């Protein structure tokens, strides 16, 4: 049978550029027959420079492969892959408002309500709960990796560091690597071990980013001081005028002992009454798959 993810290049059109990505230019466009009962669909088109190395092309395609496993309202959806001809393309759900970090920055008085903030927290936690439930550790949860849809829905959108943990429940990084130090848990910084627990730590940082309108975590501290500050028990400050529920969630997500941190399901459970009505209809939390 045919590769269900492969799409004929002819069915995809590129309307305009959105911005430069990790492996190449990302465009906004339209694709035909990628969604059921839908003639054409608006999409984001990620490309790989025709001059990219095998190493880069492999990483690019590996991210697409991982995404083929996800089907969640709060996770940016993979819609197809064009692996025949040049350039190599990956088509995904269009998130008109861009990444969450830029969206938060755009709200700065220089350049959101408690309910809006809690709604975002719930959506992100739901996507992460879905990910963890399928035995995947994201490893790079941060506002820059979440996206915002037209209707303001927030979704997990970059999986460059995502790893399958089905067999061992953890992932250990070996050797050297460029890692998101300011979003990493104490145990991860110490011995490169990543678990659903360290994903929860990063979620805490994302909450902080939301409440501060994307301030840089540990601003003023060099990477070195961050490593020491966090591993010794230090924490980011309490954002001014931050909703009590988010301060408490942060406190919980930042327990030094990973086993003391809540799970994404426990996080959602604690704030579910604050979520909008439709959350029960589209969330992984209230789905039958979660039992």
């Amino acid at each position: 049978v045919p590769d269900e993810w492969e799409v004929a290049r002819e069915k995809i059109t590129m309307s305009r550029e959105l911005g430069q990505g990790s492996f190449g230019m990302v465009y906004e466009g339209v694709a035909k027959g990628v969604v059921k009962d839908e003639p054409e669909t608006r999409v984001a088109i990620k490309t790989v420079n025709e001059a990219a190395s095998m190493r880069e092309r492999i990483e690019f395609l590996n991210e697409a492969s991982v995404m083929k496993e996800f089907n969640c309202h709060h996770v940016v959806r993979l819609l197809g892959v064009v692996s025949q001809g040049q350039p190599t393309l990956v088509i995904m759900e269009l998130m008109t408002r861009g990444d969450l970090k830029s969206y938060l920055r755009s709200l700065r008085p220089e350049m959101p309500s408690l309910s809006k903030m809690i709604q975002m927290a719930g959506e992100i936690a739901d996507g992460m709960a879905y990910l963890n439930a399928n035995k995947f550790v994201h490893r790079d949860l941060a506002a820059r990796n979440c996206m915002v849809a037209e209707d303001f829905t927030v979704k997990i959108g970059d999986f460059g560091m995502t790893r399958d943990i089905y067999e061992t429940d953890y992932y250990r990084k070996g050797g050297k690597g460029l890692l998101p130090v300011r979003w990493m848990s104490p145990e991860s910084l110490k011995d490169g071990v990543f678990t659903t627990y360290s994903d929860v730590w990063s979620f805490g940082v994302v909450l902080w980013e939301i409440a501060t309108l994307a301030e840089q975590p540990y601003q003023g501290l060099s990477n070195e001081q961050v490593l020491r500050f966090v591993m010794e028990g230090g924490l980011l400050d309490k954002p001014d005028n931050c909703p009590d529920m988010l301060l408490e969630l942060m406190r919980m997500c930042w327990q030094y002992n990973p086993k003391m941190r809540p799970s994404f399901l426990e996080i959602i459970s604690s704030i579910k009454e604050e979520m909008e009505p439709g959350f029960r209809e589209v969330s992984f939390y209230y789905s039958e798959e979660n039992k």
């Binding site: 250990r172 690597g177 998101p180 130090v181 490593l227």
Partner: peptide, 8 residues
């Protein structure tokens, strides 16, 4: 930069 070199 958000990604810093670190070795284990």
């Amino acid at each position: 930069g958000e990604y810093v070199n670190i070795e284990f």
